[PDB]
Design an enzyme around this catalytic site. Structure first.
Site, PDB file in Angstrom:
ATOM      1  N   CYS A 141      36.101 -23.562 -31.429  1.00 39.43           N
ATOM      2  CA  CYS A 141      35.187 -24.773 -31.813  1.00 39.43           C
ATOM      3  C   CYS A 141      33.828 -24.283 -31.429  1.00 39.43           C
ATOM      4  CB  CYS A 141      35.516 -25.850 -31.175  1.00 39.43           C
ATOM      5  SG  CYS A 141      37.095 -26.609 -31.925  1.00 39.43           S
ATOM      6  N   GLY A 156      39.675 -22.691 -28.214  1.00 36.11           N
ATOM      7  CA  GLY A 156      38.505 -22.283 -27.575  1.00 36.11           C
ATOM      8  C   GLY A 156      37.361 -21.696 -28.767  1.00 36.11           C
ATOM      9  N   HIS A 161      33.262 -33.024 -29.349  1.00 34.44           N
ATOM     10  CA  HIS A 161      34.581 -33.142 -28.766  1.00 34.44           C
ATOM     11  C   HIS A 161      34.641 -32.311 -27.445  1.00 34.44           C
ATOM     12  CE1 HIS A 161      36.531 -29.645 -30.103  1.00 34.44           C
ATOM     13  NE2 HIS A 161      36.180 -29.784 -31.352  1.00 34.44           N
TER      14      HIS A 161
END
Ligand SMILES: *C(=N)[C@H](C[C@@H]1CCNC1=O)NC(=O)[C@@H]1C[C@@H](C(F)(F)F)CN1C(=O)[C@@H](NC(=O)OC)C(C)(C)C
Ligand SMILES: *C(=N)[C@H](C[C@@H]1CCNC1=O)NC(=O)[C@@H]1C[C@@H](C(F)(F)F)CN1C(=O)[C@@H](NC(=O)OC)C(C)(C)C
Lengths: 305, 305
Positions: A145, A143, A41
């Site tokens: 991920c 942030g 993503h």
């Protein structure tokens, strides 16, 4: 003695964290050999996440649309591909700090250390468990991920988890390093239910053994129980059923303390039915289930890496 | 979101742990530049520990009586001295992995990460607090002495704790890296009393702010209190008095949530007088006091290192 929620030393993994930027989004990726792994993503704008066609989104991207930074070292992307929900970015440099490593899909009830990461730099390390509903109770901001979960055996890092999303519950969901989600989750910003959770009975029993090893003894009673009758109470209180496989895994602890597993079950039974009465066990007023039997042995025997 | 006991990433410190052997005893040492720091009781036998004259015992020892292993390679000891309760072993090789570092004597109530090691090799990392009676509730077995506690400040490692002994309570005592014990303790195997502990009030308030930030707002009340009035009930429950200095430290959390510090105290007062009635806060059925105001902001704003 004493007993703490203890994470693995994170040095092996810290040397593999990089920052992956695509478009405006920045998150963390894992740099092993000449491949960087990160959540797919990263290629989404905030509108896409409502309903993303990832294949079509990826086709608009080329190698030079991916900015990969290892500290200040700017890696050159020479190849990109999707594997399930992870992006694999081929870079021109093998990571010199790469540890010996495996990719593992862990099973519910197992634990792992998380190295929480922002902008490619480590922020903190803590212990998590794979809940029976394939979520984890982490600590993750925007942030984070691409932060990974791992175990270490002597010298070999076993990567088991990469962070993808936060559910409505405040719980966390992610993939293994082949990009397959744990649980039924998809990487789309739509309401998603986690199943009913339950308590990891074999871990609670292992934590009671740890308690006894450390002198916390008050819950040991004069009773016993059978596996089938204990299981009746466990279903009543949302505990996993105990199997003979679990009984066998508790062998080391059972042997070192001279308390039979079914004796310790009868103590758990009485704790479940009568509560804790305001007393504590290893400093907790609740029954702890984030310690596997291996976690207890490692901490009560001193295993190093 | 979420809230966890988060340790600092331990990579910078792992490259500093060596194994220090003198005679029969082996423990851990910290190798910075061309000096190895370790606890002086490494020079003791099991009978000396009952009543040791350390100056006399160090005189029977030569440079070649100490042997330092960094992983597999040996370091040459070319000098040895006693600074309070630590041994400084001058080696012939500066540690190529030495981080930018300071030595800090921390204050009661502050927290640090502990890297637990055995035989010079890291085993696990966890967060600890210096209790108001200058002990820590750690997890340490035989051979763990010389494990260090530390904080990280971007690139700088602040070393604040070297592990020395376990007290009768199962609690732990140690020194700073100039070898001065925290607390009234001495490195002699005799009955030693830790004073009565108390609960770190400013840390408990910082943890209630973390609860509000993460959505647990049930304890928020429709009353308020005063500084002095709160200190009367805090002393009744063995809590440190709340000072205006502590009020000022909680400013950042106070500003982000919009709840004045004195409002949070009146919620804490009613938690102390009335208990939790079987509810949990951030997954705990007890009041947590091992998170400083700075630990909460680090975790609820994402600071990296
Ligand atoms: C990664 N950087 C973030 C981490 C997330 C933010 C707050 N706490 C966290 O763990 N991951 C995301 O924002 C994902 C990316 C999108 C998607 F998963 F691809 F759809 C949206 N994300 C979410 O986590 C959403 N959760 C969700 O949709 O649950 C079904 C929220 C948190 C609403 C943005
Ligand atoms: C260092 N490797 C050990 C760690 C200790 C062992 C069990 N759990 C621990 O944390 N340090 C010691 O054994 C010290 C060395 C001796 C002395 F401190 F120098 F005197 C004795 N030590 C102790 O920890 C003793 N505690 C004590 O005397 O406190 C009053 C015990 C645990 C009885 C050996």
């Amino acid at each position: 003695s004493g007993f703490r929620k203890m994470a693995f030393p994170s040095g092996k993994v810290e040397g593999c964290m990089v920052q992956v930027t695509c478009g405006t989004t920045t998150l963390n990726g894992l740099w092993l050999d000449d491949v960087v792994y990160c959540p797919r993503h990263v290629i989404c704008t905030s509108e896409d996440m409502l309903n993303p066609n990832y294949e079509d989104l990826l086709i608009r991207k080329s190698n030079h649309n991916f900015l990969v930074q290892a500290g200040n070292v700017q890696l050159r992307v020479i190849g990109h591909s999707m594997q399930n929900c992870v992006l694999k970015l081929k870079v021109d440099t093998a990571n010199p700090k790469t540890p010996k490593y495996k990719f593992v899909r862990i099973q519910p009830g197992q634990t792992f250390s998380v190295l929480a990461c922002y902008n490619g730099s480590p922020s903190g390390v803590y212990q998590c468990a794979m809940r029976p509903n394939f979520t984890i109770k982490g600590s993750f901001l925007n942030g984070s991920c691409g932060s990974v979960g791992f175990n270490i055996d002597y010298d070999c890092v076993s990567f088991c988890y990469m962070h993808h999303m936060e559910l409505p519950t405040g719980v966390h969901a992610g993939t293994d390093l082949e990009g397959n989600f744990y649980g039924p989750f998809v990487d789309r910003q739509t309401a998603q239910a986690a199943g009913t959770d339950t308590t990891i009975t074999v871990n609670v029993l292992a934590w009671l053994y740890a308690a006894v090893i450390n002198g916390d003894r008050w819950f040991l009673n004069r009773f016993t129980t059978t596996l089938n009758d204990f299981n009746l109470v466990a279903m009543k209180y949302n505990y996993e059923p105990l199997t003979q496989d679990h009984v066998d895994i508790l062998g080391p602890l059972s042997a070192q303390t001279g308390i039979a597993v079914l004796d310790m079950c009868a103590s758990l039974k009485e704790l479940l039915q009568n509560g804790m009465n305001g007393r504590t066990i290893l400093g907790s007023a609740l029954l702890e289930d984030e310690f596997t039997p291996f976690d207890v042995v490692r901490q009560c025997s001193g295993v190093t890496f």
